[PDB]
């Protein structure tokens, strides 16, 4: 007979693009606005396909591109209502602080009466301000941008979130134990709703990320090319925890009607330089395993060296810890660390910056209010960002350096196995059935 | 690793005939036009794709690991140095004097 027939609900899909909405698991306003995100299911379905093969290139994935877009918008939205610190940067007369880590000085600011003005003192870090020339300074960014205070109530701490597809679409993830970004993978499972993806922010060391399994996964757009970064993924995480011992104080200085901002008020106790601690023996073995994995992709001896240079954002390790922003040297880990064929730690002295140019797009900056009391944060290192020197046809050396080439690579580590796709439940198969 | 080779290193041909130069290498390749003391100018990229502005006479062919550069209908001001440029290695170019 060979009569056409229409089958509804058949397994056919093709590459497709769409918008994914937020979902969260489980009182105080959050920058991510997780209250808006719908609750996640108690037990997401993890159906696994039996015998099928598919290939995808994560570098062309748009899930990461959308994540960067909406995360950028979310930060902008949270800062719309609360005050902007535009008037603050005037001629500042600063000499030194009684307690060049921190500088103490004052400025003239408006009061309840607009015509009248008052003199108020405040504390700023040395790198926060810049010298006009003697003894006079201005905020690092007022002749090229406008600084806005971050709303004190919101908390910037990352909370796991689910990028969860809508109805009629599916997300394919394959659990190949060893598999880089590109290439086919034969064990692919369909998950409607993705798993936890913490929006951690860092520049040199990836922290609070999912660990690898069975291998030290290494991913990069092209190994031969030098511009593209190289992402490491460690199966055994390294515990890094550190605290700033200094005790701060909160002070309020005011510039307009109902508009108040918080500046560093005073230092309590003896001034002590903050630092961070890492294990000696554990970290060294971590790099040895990484060096071995890198060797087979180049067939040359692997060497490490510090960052070449640049602005403080990349040349120093940065992260979020209890509402404070850090910029640390992380140079002892990548100095003279050429690899051959105890109860001691690594000290990484560093300091804190208030005015931050995060989300490096022209136009605006941010200010992080200070908080009284010390901060403690313990994090686990999972993956590294590296950039090959690329010094031509080198004899046997391929010296490596750290540095985050682009911020988008922070989330590409956790999205290397994911792909949105549209499903068409219609088909026209051959059958002998024919309607009366 | 990246490998480069420019076998001829020198070529002298008449005007109006068909002339070409040979470069062998692995990876993306580009061709440039360098005069005496002037900045190089890009002729064709991605092996065979043409650039906007350069005359259509310049052309090339991608064959496996062998890269051609077809030059036909010569005019004056087209006599300058040619070299093939992979990401980081650039061997000395070849001259098309006459």
């Amino acid at each position, epitope marked *: 007979g060979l009569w056409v027939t229409v089958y509804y609900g058949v397994p056919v899909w093709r590459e497709a693009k769409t918008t994914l909405f937020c979902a969260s698991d489980a009182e105080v306003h959050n920058v991510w606005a997780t209250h808006a995100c719908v609750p996640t299911d108690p037990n997401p379905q993890e159906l696994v396909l039996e015998n099928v093969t598919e290939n995808f290139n994560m570098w062309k994935n748009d899930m990461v591109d959308q994540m960067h877009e909406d995360i950028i918008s979310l930060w902008d939205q949270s800062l719309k209502p609360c005050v902007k610190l535009t008037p603050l940067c005037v001629t500042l007369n600063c000499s030194d602080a009684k307690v060049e880590e921190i500088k103490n000085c004052s400025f003239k600011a408006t009061t309840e009466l607009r015509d009248k003005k008052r003199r108020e003192y405040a504390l700023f870090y040395r790198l926060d301000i810049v010298p006009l020339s003697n003894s006079e300074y201005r905020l690092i960014n007022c002749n*090229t941008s406008v600084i806005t205070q971050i709303c004190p109530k919101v908390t910037f701490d990352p909370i796991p979130i689910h990028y969860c597809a809508p109805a009629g679409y599916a997300i394919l993830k394959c659990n190949n134990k060893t598999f880089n970004g590109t290439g086919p993978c034969n064990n692919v499972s369909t998950v409607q709703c993705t798993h936890g993806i913490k929006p951690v922010v860092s520049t040199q060391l990836l922290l609070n990320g999912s660990l690898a399994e069975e291998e030290i996964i290494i991913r990069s757009e092209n190994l031969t090319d030098n511009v593209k970064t190289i992402i490491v993924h460690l199966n055994e995480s390294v515990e890094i925890t550190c605290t700033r011992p200094n005790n701060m104080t909160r002070k309020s200085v005011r510039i307009g009607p109902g508009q108040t901002f918080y500046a560093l008020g005073d230092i309590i106790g003896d001034i002590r330089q903050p630092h961070c601690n890492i294990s000696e023996i554990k970290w060294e073995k971590t790099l040895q395993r990484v060096s071995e994995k890198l060797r087979e992709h180049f067939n040359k001896t692997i060497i490490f060296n510090q960052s070449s*240079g640049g602005d403080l954002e990349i040349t120093t390790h940065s992260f979020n810890c209890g509402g404070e922003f850090f910029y640390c040297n992380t140079s002892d880990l990548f100095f003279n660390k050429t690899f051959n064929e105890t109860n001691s730690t690594i000290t990484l002295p560093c300091r804190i910056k208030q005015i931050i140019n995060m989300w490096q797009e*022209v136009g605006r900056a941010m200010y992080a209010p200070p908080i009284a009391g010390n901060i403690t944060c313990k994090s686990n290192i999972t993956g590294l960002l590296l950039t090959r020197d690329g*010094g*031509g046809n080198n004899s046997t050396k391929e010296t490596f350096r750290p540095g985050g080439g682009n911020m988008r690579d922070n989330w590409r580590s956790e999205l290397y196995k994911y792909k949105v796709v549209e499903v068409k439940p219609l088909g026209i198969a051959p059958t002998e059935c024919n309607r009366t | 690793d990246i490998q480069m080779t420019q076998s001829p290193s020198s070529l002298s041909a008449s005007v109006g005939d068909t002339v070409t130069i040979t470069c062998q290498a692995n990876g993306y390749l580009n061709w440039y036009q360098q005069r005496r003391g002037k900045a190089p100018k890009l002729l064709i990229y991605d092996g065979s794709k043409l650039e906007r502005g350069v005359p259509s006479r310049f052309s090339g062919r991608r064959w496996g690991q062998e890269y051609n550069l077809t030059i036909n209908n010569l005019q004056p001001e087209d006599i300058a140095t040619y*070299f093939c440029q992979v990401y980081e290695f*650039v061997v000395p170019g070849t001259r098309l004097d006459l």
Partner: nanobody, 121 residues
């Protein structure tokens, strides 16, 4: 409209330092890399490195490693970025001409080049 300015040729005694300035104003500088090349007499081009306009992270071969330093400095407005190049020690064989290029579209193709600066030792 897209063009690059260049500093004038200068000559310095051995052991001194030299400064070469490149400017880009005809496009969105932050979206394209900048690369530096050296053209010594008697041989072909020699690579120097690149500087990312978004963040001044250099990348240089071992031959010039530790001496050449690439720095960027935007103007008052985010246009007409100026790219510099400083090296500490000059050898007797450093005489060459330094160019200023641009990378785009994932391909090491340089459609814009600087006039070049000739420096002796």
């Amino acid at each position: 409209q897209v063009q690059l300015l260049q500093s004038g040729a200068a000559v310095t005694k051995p052991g001194a330092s030299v400064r070469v300035s490149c400017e880009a104003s005809g496009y969105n500088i932050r979206d394209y890399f900048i690369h530096w090349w050296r053209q010594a007499p008697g041989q072909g081009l020699q690579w120097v490195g690149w500087i990312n306009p978004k963040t001044g992270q250099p990348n240089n071969p071992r031959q010039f490693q530790g001496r050449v330093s690439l720095t960027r400095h935007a103007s008052w407005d985010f246009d007409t970025y100026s790219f510099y190049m400083d090296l500490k020690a000059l050898r007797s064989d450093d005489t060459a001409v330094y160019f200023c290029a641009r990378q785009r579209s994932d391909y090491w193709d340089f459609d814009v080049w600087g006039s070049g600066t000739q420096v002796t030792v």
